[PDB]
């Protein structure tokens, strides 16, 4: 979905201030040419959207859509691709209209779309075109939401946006309840090794598969064990065939980052209860068991790189070496002989990766430094140490050292002598603060990871895994999560519709081999044609027991939990079931930041910005308005003089804090002095 993306803005297109309110709307000629759900939700809403599923681009650059032509009330199977003008010329029927299994319509009055987007009924003689399918009007990633027809549009928008920010875990189990658009949307994304030509497997390992073709030839497919993606996530590719099988041309032969047996898999299937629990799951917070930390259910691998380059300079040439001046022998243990680290050394924040030293030049010394060097006898050591230290708050192993050179004749840029890249990799668990979400836009950070025993269990001893909140469901109109929870519990336990005296009345229009299913079975409700509510009731009534004679969930879909902490049962039955949640890329370790005293800006003398540097937070205009509105003035004087710009004030504040004296009275800011000099340089006498 980063490809197949339509953007109304760019070079030769309108900017966001020229973007009127009219261009962000959904014109009624978007049916099947551009998805109305999937779009960003910031200030760029409606300007960026994605293509639909069956849409196709014209030779001239228009967007064509298929339609089944119906002749004289007989729906044919010829397919005509139609652009918007021809879509306006005719009238176009509905997708799920009751065809009479001959091409004929059941009812004489059919819903239809007129020229200008009017929605009317019509006698069936006038209809000359029909849709190819439901879910034609919707995108790729929005067609992967189960029970979309029950949600709203804004929470479906949030679900379709937050579906793509999922991270790859280590296990990557396929979802129980999904739509039909996982297999196609996984093998068409190219991140799955697919057998080009049929044959039989000769040899498998964790790196290479060699199939044997039908005529003599063989072919090695090389995997990608732990490649780094473009954002710091893992890219494993494990094989899923054994050494005797026979693959056909097009068979999935190896999983990708987020795949399981070919189809997509973005998270795990987790048991959930919908009670509010002691204010920890308050206002879109999610609590979890300790089983997810223990059994490594939610655990992603993140791989970062660090890069440094030994180059020439004016005074000489920097060298990568072990002999770093003014350093101990304690930090020089992990370093090997050529200066870089070994492979496998677990590092912490502030340790030496590449030992590089610069020619310092000539400087004069302070007399205290001079007599201290005379006292300890140590020499001058005229070269200055500038190594590559791993930044603040990072750890993990060291995977691989790819070091280039000039002498080995590599394409290095002009003036550079030795390039070297070190790859650090950590294995992040789940933690309170990390952002989780389902597939219907029900996001929420992790409030508190409970232990296992103080977690409300069923009448079987099975503990629940996460506990959602009740008050966030009915005011957001996304009961698709409750329907998905019910159908997930049915698909996990498995059912058997007892057609002893005939097929019952709810399941008369169900397919065959859905009257009964094994436990842990997979199902697939498509987007706009799926499991009905009456069929959900009928499936949930007959729900064959676990190990004993025990139907833990009654016909309402609820169970009688026990309080794991106090001991008594909860006095009312509580909805449980098997939901599917994903771990998003909004982890805490990329957000937590602090600063005592770091670097400063160049022209003005303020502290710097962002977690990439050290940087401090921005105390803007509205917060100054709040501090004025309190009447608190001394704190405003603090924050505007002796923390940002008082160049002689900062060091006195630091010395006063360390020695234990009172904070001195502040002075004028250097930014004001810069203002004064610019006003004097605009030929304005400011006295």
């Amino acid at each position: 979905t980063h490809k197949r993306r339509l953007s109304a803005l760019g070079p030769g297109g309108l900017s966001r201030e020229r973007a009127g309110l009219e261009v962000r709307d959904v014109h009624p000629s978007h049916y099947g040419r551009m998805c109305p759900i999937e779009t960003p939700e910031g200030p760029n809403i409606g300007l960026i959207g994605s293509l639909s599923v069956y849409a196709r681009v014209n030779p001239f650059g228009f967007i064509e859509t298929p339609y089944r032509k119906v002749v004289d009330g007989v729906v044919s199977d010829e397919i005509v691709y139609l652009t918007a003008d021809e879509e306006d010329r005719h009238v176009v029927a509905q997708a799920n209209s009751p065809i009479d299994a001959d091409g004929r319509f059941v009812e004489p009055r059919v819903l239809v779309r007129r020229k200008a987007g009017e929605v009317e009924y019509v006698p069936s003689s006038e209809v000359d075109y029909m849709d190819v399918s439901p879910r034609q009007m919707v995108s790729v990633a929005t067609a992967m939401i189960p029970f979309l027809e029950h949600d709203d549009a804004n929470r479906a928008l949030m679900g379709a946006n937050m579906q793509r920010q999922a991270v790859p875990l280590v296990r990557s189990e396929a979802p129980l309840v999904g739509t039909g658009m996982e297999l196609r949307a996984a093998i068409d994304a190219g991140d799955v090794v697919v057998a080009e030509e049929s044959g039989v497997i000769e040899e498998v390992s964790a790196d290479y598969i060699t199939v044997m073709h039908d005529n003599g030839t063989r072919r090695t497919y090389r995997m990608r064990k732990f490649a780094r993606s473009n954002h710091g996530t893992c890219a494993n590719q494990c094989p899923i065939v054994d050494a005797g099988d026979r693959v056909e041309a097009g068979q999935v032969i190896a999983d990708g980052p987020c795949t399981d047996d070919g189809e997509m898999a973005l998270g795990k299937n987790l048991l959930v209860a919908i009670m509010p629990w002691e204010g920890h799951n308050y206002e879109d917070a999610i609590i979890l068991s300790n089983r997810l930390v223990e059994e490594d259910v939610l655990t992603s691998i993140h791989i970062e790189e660090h890069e440094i380059d030994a180059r020439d300079t004016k005074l000489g040439a920097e060298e990568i070496t072990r002999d770093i001046p003014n350093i101990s022998d304690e930090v020089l243990a992990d370093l090997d002989e050529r200066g870089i680290v070994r492979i496998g050394a677990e590092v912490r924040d502030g340790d030496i990766l590449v030992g590089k030293v610069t020619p310092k030049g000539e400087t004069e010394l302070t007399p205290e430094e001079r007599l201290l060097r005379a006292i300890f006898g140590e020499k001058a050591r005229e070269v200055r140490d500038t190594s590559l230290k791993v930044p603040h708050g990072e750890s993990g192993k060291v995977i691989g050292i790819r070091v280039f050179s000039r002498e080995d004749e590599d394409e290095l840029p002009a003036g550079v002598n030795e390039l070297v890249r070190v790859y650090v990799a950590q294995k992040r668990k789940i933690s309170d603060g990390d952002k989780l979400a389902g597939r219907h836009g029900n996001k929420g950070v992790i409030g508190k990871i409970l232990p296992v025993e103080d977690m409300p269990f069923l009448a079987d001893g099975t503990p629940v895994d996460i506990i959602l909140n009740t008050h966030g469901v009915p005011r957001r109109m996304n009961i698709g999560q409750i329907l998905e929870t019910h159908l997930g519990w049915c698909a996990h336990s498995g059912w058997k519709v007892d057609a002893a005296k005939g097929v019952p009345d709810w399941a008369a229009r169900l397919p065959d081999e859905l009257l009964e299913a094994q436990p842990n079975a997979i199902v697939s409700t498509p987007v706009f044609d799926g499991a009905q509510e009456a069929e959900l009731q009928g499936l949930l009534s007959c729900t064959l027991p676990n190990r004993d004679g025990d139907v833990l969930v009654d016909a309402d879909g609820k169970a009688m939990l026990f309080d794991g902490r106090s001991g008594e049962p909860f006095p009312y039955p509580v909805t449980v079931g098997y939901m599917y949640i994903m771990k998003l890329h909004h982890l805490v370790d990329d957000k937590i930041h602090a600063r005592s005293t770091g670097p400063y800006s160049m022209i003005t003398q303020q502290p710097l910005g962002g977690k990439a540097q050290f940087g401090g937070q921005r105390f803007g205009e509205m917060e100054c308005w709040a501090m004025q509105a309190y009447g608190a003035a001394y704190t405003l004087q603090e924050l505007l003089t002796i923390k940002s710009d008082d160049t002689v004030g900062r060091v006195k504040v630091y010395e006063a804090i360390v020695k234990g004296e009172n904070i001195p009275e502040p002075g004028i800011p250097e930014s004001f002095k810069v203002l004064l000099k610019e006003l004097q340089s605009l030929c304005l006498n400011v006295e």
């Binding site: 197949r4 681009v57 190819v132 399918s133 039909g180 196609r184 070919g262 997979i522 044609d529």
Partner: peptide, 27 residues
Amino acid sequence: NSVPGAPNRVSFAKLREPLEVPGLLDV
């Protein structure tokens, strides 16, 4: 269906469709 290594994922879909999904990188 019609993909040779597919897992048997049973569907609740009531109505047949004529056209399979085109190649998603075709644009």
